[PDB]
Design a binder for these strands. Structure first.
Ligand SMILES: *[C@H]1O[C@H](CO)[C@H](O)[C@H](O)[C@H]1NC(C)=O
Ligand SMILES: [Mg+2]
Ligand SMILES: [Mg+2]
Ligand SMILES: [Mg+2]
Ligand SMILES: [Mg+2]
Ligand SMILES: [Mg+2]
Ligand SMILES: [Mg+2]
Ligand SMILES: [Mg+2]
Ligand SMILES: [Mg+2]
Ligand SMILES: [Mg+2]
Ligand SMILES: [Mg+2]
Ligand SMILES: [Mg+2]
Ligand SMILES: [Mg+2]
Ligand SMILES: [Mg+2]
Ligand SMILES: [Mg+2]
Ligand SMILES: [Mg+2]
Ligand SMILES: [Mg+2]
Ligand SMILES: [Mg+2]
Ligand SMILES: [Mg+2]
Ligand SMILES: [Mg+2]
Ligand SMILES: [Mg+2]
Ligand SMILES: [Mg+2]
Ligand SMILES: [Mg+2]
Ligand SMILES: [Mg+2]
Ligand SMILES: [Mg+2]
Ligand SMILES: [Mg+2]
Ligand SMILES: [Mg+2]
Ligand SMILES: [Mg+2]
Ligand SMILES: [Mg+2]
Ligand SMILES: [Mg+2]
Ligand SMILES: [Mg+2]
Ligand SMILES: [Mg+2]
Ligand SMILES: [Mg+2]
Ligand SMILES: [Mg+2]
Ligand SMILES: [Mg+2]
Ligand SMILES: [Mg+2]
Ligand SMILES: [Mg+2]
Ligand SMILES: [Mg+2]
Ligand SMILES: [Mg+2]
Ligand SMILES: [Mg+2]
Ligand SMILES: [Mg+2]
Ligand SMILES: [Mg+2]
Ligand SMILES: [Mg+2]
Ligand SMILES: [Mg+2]
Lengths: 110, 48, 19, 142, 103, 117, 150, 56
RNA sequence: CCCGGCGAGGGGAGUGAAAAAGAACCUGAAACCGUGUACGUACAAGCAGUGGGAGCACGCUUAGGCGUGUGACUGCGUACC
RNA sequence: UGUAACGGGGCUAAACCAUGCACCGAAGCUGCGGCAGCGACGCGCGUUGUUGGGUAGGGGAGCGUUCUGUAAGCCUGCGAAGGUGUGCUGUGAGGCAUGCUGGAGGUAUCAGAAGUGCGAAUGCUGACAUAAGUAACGAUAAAGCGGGUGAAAAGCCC
């Protein structure tokens, strides 16, 4: 029985958040929660909240035992880029992309 | 004789040249004007 | 699409004079 | 039907031993290069190594004609600027005599991976004794 | 037993019960054909080599299907010279099932 | 009467992109690059239908040259022999016999040897 | 197109494609390269060729049994129910009714039957003669159409 | 200095073959509180090697 | 109702014909970015295809060829305008 | 820059001259199947001959797109257009069928009209890549610690 949790429009480029997600892909939730706790990355905070929500979803909605859950699927999709003007030397402008990501975690007993 | 069975005589309706619509047609690219010079130019050509 | 180009800005180096 | 192709998981490679003593370098090399590739077999496929294993003995005693013994020069470049090294045939025979057969055969084999895999079936020796008794090599008169 | 016969400008090495794709024959989808110009017949040790045909050599074949082979795209292209030409092609064949080889 | 090109252009590009399946990188993703690649595949295909006939005859000859030299005659003599003896079995079949029926091939080599004798 | 004739940027030095007008038909929001004007699509048809074509069409309407000639075709009151009834009895649905002088009542009756048209002989067009399944001409009308075409 | 040719998604992938994070080998367990913690670091509750060193 | 900062965001529930119609909302293409599976790939040199072609995986209706994916190895091969 | 004046290996012939006889070798020729053009001859269809590399360019014949008529017809909530697969099909532009998506349009035929076909124009607009998680975070006046608040405090408050 698969249960899902997404953080949509997360402030953080997919690339940055993918480094963290690769650590817990296939791990037991307990094992993964620990890994994230001692990962010194902003993204580790982001992904731990979505993994925590997924576990909560899987306990409350579906009658699932937290002891039996593994991180079955995890992936991060590129979200909308917020466009900003960055002034450069000699009165020229650059266009800064504030890259957002969609973080999806699927936990299951399988 | 209905409105969807009247045909024109054979040879009465020759289809116009359409220039610059690809290689197949034989009038692609330069559209029959050749390469450069006055006669290849929009509004080009010497007077009578 | 492309932004409207800038008016001339200051140049770091002179174009080399081939003449 | 489609033309037969030798299959590299079902091909019968056989062991031969050749004495190079007195043999002309080039004329021995061609016969080696021919059998390494499998150009002596009906099942010859240009993309499959169908050739045989060839132990070459007495590499040190291989013959050359004319003044080639002194005047045939082997060049290589180390890849370092000015790194053009040369050895005569007699120097090569004095120092590393297996290389003379190996070099000659290697220029006569297809280039590219299969060419290199073919060359791996040539066992050259400077003496009259090999280690491959186990492979039960047949004598071959080239 | 196997035999070698010429049909449609090509040669075929066939045995009884083999289907063989030839160039289009002008014969209906049930009818039989006799290939009389036979170049070789082999029964292991016994081997009849034609000179250039084997005297009384005959291959009785049943025409099993006509049809057009897989489409082939012909592409002509002269780079920089404004010339491109494409053409399709399916070659007609005639699958025959070899019913009997006789020497 | 205004004509939007959307639907037709979409289909032309898909046609080309489908023929470019399996190609590396932009060559299977990028119309401008897939088109060039699909043309060049076409040009090679045309060229190679001819080359295929050259390559197979070359293979057949190599195999007949092996099988003949096993039977103690060169390809050149053997083929000359087969013509003098009026044998018309083509190289595709000779090569096929040289692999599959080595008895039959010896027979053919004897008939060759006879004609030259 | 609404906009200034100001050159959008200088001719040389910007690294961009040279531009002259923001109204260039190459540009989004630009002019249409060969913008339509109102056109007269009317063709000249020679009088004799027009009359020729009418004669060809009528001659066909006889050969395909589509020209049903009667002597008198009218209705009592201006009522669509009456003409609908008359047409189901005379056994036709889609029909062009050519009468001598256009009777106000038959005009009004037909008006709301979309398959039925009612004209005077002066008002026969070639498209209507071909468009309708059956053409009902009054003997009086045939005389006028004869006189009209000669 | 700038690229003459867009590098491929392949080449980008290859350069990032080294970018992967290493998960902490294994957490240590406090002999007293039983808390997991980074090795040679105090626990969240404030223990280190059995001793309660800080007040929370 | 539940996770979360009395958040953002999400999972249930419910509405609805439909919520992968949830307001960043009809359809939802392509570039571009990912997750998963099959095959290939760490002794190998170049327009990256093409002709040949083993092996492996899969699906079929002779349990057999046939279809699909992949493509070791090998001939030829310097994009387009 | 490196053998570097046989393409290489190698060769005393695997060199050169002479004679001879074989074989290899092209999209040449032949064979087999197929298509098309032109001219002959019969009577639209046979037969036969022959031709079919092509830029500028001339000639001929078509495909498909939107719109008008044919159409108050025909297809369509038992699923239209569009999207995305698959299969079949034609010498090509293309066509047909159908799974899934989609949720209300579509349109034969034969004619009619064109804003009718895009890869290039340092083309235009939008979107998205690359370089790259790289450079940089704007004066080198400078921070340290305790407490507080808080989900969180180098930066806030004391
Ligand atoms: C930069 O180039 C401009 C011309 O484009 C002027 O020559 C200017 O003086 C130059 N400045 C420098 C520093 O050379
Ligand atoms: Mg300024
Ligand atoms: Mg031309
Ligand atoms: Mg030009
Ligand atoms: Mg000129
Ligand atoms: Mg000119
Ligand atoms: Mg002008
Ligand atoms: Mg653009
Ligand atoms: Mg080579
Ligand atoms: Mg419109
Ligand atoms: Mg794709
Ligand atoms: Mg406008
Ligand atoms: Mg008038
Ligand atoms: Mg360049
Ligand atoms: Mg890195
Ligand atoms: Mg909410
Ligand atoms: Mg609606
Ligand atoms: Mg939508
Ligand atoms: Mg997409
Ligand atoms: Mg190596
Ligand atoms: Mg390897
Ligand atoms: Mg490389
Ligand atoms: Mg090459
Ligand atoms: Mg030097
Ligand atoms: Mg010959
Ligand atoms: Mg040939
Ligand atoms: Mg020819
Ligand atoms: Mg020709
Ligand atoms: Mg031509
Ligand atoms: Mg429409
Ligand atoms: Mg219509
Ligand atoms: Mg247009
Ligand atoms: Mg475009
Ligand atoms: Mg172009
Ligand atoms: Mg950019
Ligand atoms: Mg950093
Ligand atoms: Mg860098
Ligand atoms: Mg750096
Ligand atoms: Mg820095
Ligand atoms: Mg600062
Ligand atoms: Mg916060
Ligand atoms: Mg403090
Ligand atoms: Mg500070
Ligand atoms: Mg202070």
């Amino acid at each position: 029985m698969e249960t899902i949790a997404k953080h949509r429009h997360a402030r953080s480029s997919a690339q940055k958040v993918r480094l963290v997600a690769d650590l817990i892909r296939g791990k037991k939730v307990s094992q993964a929660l620990d890994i994230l706790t001692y990962t010194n990355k902003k993204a580790a905070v982001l992904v731990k909240k979505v993994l925590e929500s997924a576990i909560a979803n899987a306990e409350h909605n579906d009658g699932a035992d937290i002891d039996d859950l593994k991180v079955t699927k995890i992936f991060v999709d590129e979200g909308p880029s917020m466009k900003r003007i960055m002034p450069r030397a000699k009165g020229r402008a650059d266009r800064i992309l504030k890259r957002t990501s969609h973080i999806t975690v699927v936990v299951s007993d399988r | 004789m209905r409105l969807n069975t009247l045909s024109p005589a054979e040879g009465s309706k020759k289809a116009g040249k359409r220039l610059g619509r690809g290689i197949g047609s034989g009038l692609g690219k330069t559209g029959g004007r050749g390469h450069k010079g006055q006669k290849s130019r929009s509004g080009g050509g010497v007077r009578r | 699409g492309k932004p409207r180009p800038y008016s001339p800005r200051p140049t770091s180096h002179p174009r080399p004079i081939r003449v | 039907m489609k033309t037969f192709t030798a299959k590299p998981e079902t091909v019968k490679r056989d062991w031969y031993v050749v004495d190079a003593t007195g043999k002309t370098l080039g004329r021995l090399a061609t016969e080696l290069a021919r059998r390494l590739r499998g150009k002596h077999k009906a099942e010859y496929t240009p993309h499959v190594d169908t050739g045989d294993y060839i132990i070459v003995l007495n590499a040190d005693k291989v013959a050359v004609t004319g003044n080639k013994r002194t005047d045939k020069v082997y060049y290589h470049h180390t890849g370092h600027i000015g790194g053009i090294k040369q050895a005569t045939f007699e120097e090569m025979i004095a120092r590393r005599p297996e290389r003379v057969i190996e070099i000659a055969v290697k220029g006569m084999l297809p280039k590219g991976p299969l060419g290199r895999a073919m060359f791996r079936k040539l066992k050259v020796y400077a003496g009259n004794e090999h280690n491959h008794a186990a492979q039960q090599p047949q004598v071959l008169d080239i | 037993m196997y035999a070698v016969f010429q049909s449609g400008g090509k040669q075929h090495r066939v045995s009884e019960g083999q289907t063989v794709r030839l160039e289009k024959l002008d014969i209906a989808t049930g009818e039989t054909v006799e290939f009389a110009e036979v170049l070789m017949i082999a029964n292991g040790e016994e081997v009849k080599i034609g000179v250039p045909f084997v005297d009384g050599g005959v291959i009785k074949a049943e025409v099993v299907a006509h049809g057009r082979g897989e489409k082939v795209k012909i592409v002509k292209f002269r780079r920089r010279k404004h010339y491109r030409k494409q053409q399709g092609h399916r070659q007609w064949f005639t699958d025959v099932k070899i019913t009997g080889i006789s020497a | 009467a205004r004509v939007k090109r959307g639907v037709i252009a979409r289909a032309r590009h898909k046609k080309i992109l489908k023929q470019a399946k399996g190609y590396y990188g932009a060559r299977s993703r990028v119309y401008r690059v897939a088109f060039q690649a699909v043309i060049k595949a076409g040009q090679y295909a045309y060229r190679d239908r001819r080359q295929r006939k050259r390559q197979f005859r070359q293979l057949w000859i190599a195999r007949i040259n092996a099988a003949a030299r096993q039977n103690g005659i060169s390809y050149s003599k053997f083929i000359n022999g087969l013509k003098k003896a009026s044998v018309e079995i083509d190289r595709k079949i000779l090569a096929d016999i040289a692999v599959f029926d080595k008895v039959a091939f010896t027979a053919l080599v004897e008939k060759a040897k006879a004609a030259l004798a | 197109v609404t906009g200034s004739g100001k050159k959008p940027w200088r001719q040389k030095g910007t690294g961009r494609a040279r531009s002259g007008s923001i109204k260039s038909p190459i540009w989004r929001s630009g002019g249409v390269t060969f913008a339509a004007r109102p056109q007269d699509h009317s063709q000249k048809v020679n009088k004799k060729m027009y009359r020729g074509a009418l004669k060809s069409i009528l001659s066909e309407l006889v050969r395909q049994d589509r020209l049903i000639v009667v002597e008198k075709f009218s209705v009592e009151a201006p009522k669509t129910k009456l003409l609908a009834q008359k047409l189901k009895d005379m056994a036709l649905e889609d029909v062009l009714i050519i009468t001598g002088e256009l009777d106000e009542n038959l005009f009004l009756a037909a008006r709301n039957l979309h398959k039925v048209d009612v004209r005077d002989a002066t008002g026969i067009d070639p498209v209507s003669l071909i468009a309708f399944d059956k053409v009902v001409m009054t003997a009086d009308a045939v005389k006028q159409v004869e006189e009209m075409l000669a | 200095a700038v690229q003459q040719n867009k590098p491929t998604r392949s080449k980008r992938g290859m350069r990032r073959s080294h970018d992967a994070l290493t998960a902490v080998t294994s957490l240590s367990v406090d002999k007293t509180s039983g808390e997991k913690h980074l090795r040679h670091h105090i626990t969240a509750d404030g223990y280190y090697r059995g001793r309660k060193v800080i007040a929370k």
